[PDB]
């Protein structure tokens, strides 16, 4: 959140690994940006 602009950058990349966050290099492209204006201080995900 930057002055009420809330921004997302992201990636899906394929891998093949058993355990840990893979070592390596890839960047996240910008996906979306929403002028939500609010004061996020904390957050939670959503499982299904």
């Amino acid at each position: 959140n930057i002055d009420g602009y809330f921004k997302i950058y992201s990636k899906h990349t394929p891998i093949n690994l058993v355990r840990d966050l893979p070592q390596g290099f890839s960047a996240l492209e910008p996906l979306v940006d929403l002028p939500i204006g609010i004061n996020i201080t904390r957050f939670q995900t959503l499982l299904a």
């Binding site: 002055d3 009420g4 602009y5 002028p35 204006g37």
Partner: protein, 48 residues
Amino acid sequence: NCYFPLQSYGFQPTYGVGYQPYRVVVLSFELLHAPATVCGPKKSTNLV
């Protein structure tokens, strides 16, 4: 001296130009405390 507060208007296409009904829009906006999420249209001209 108890009175019900409302008084529904009476409409007749016969009425005087004043007692006739008139629709209103007030384009209200509250200004300049947050990120802008409206603008007027941005013109364009053909490419040389």
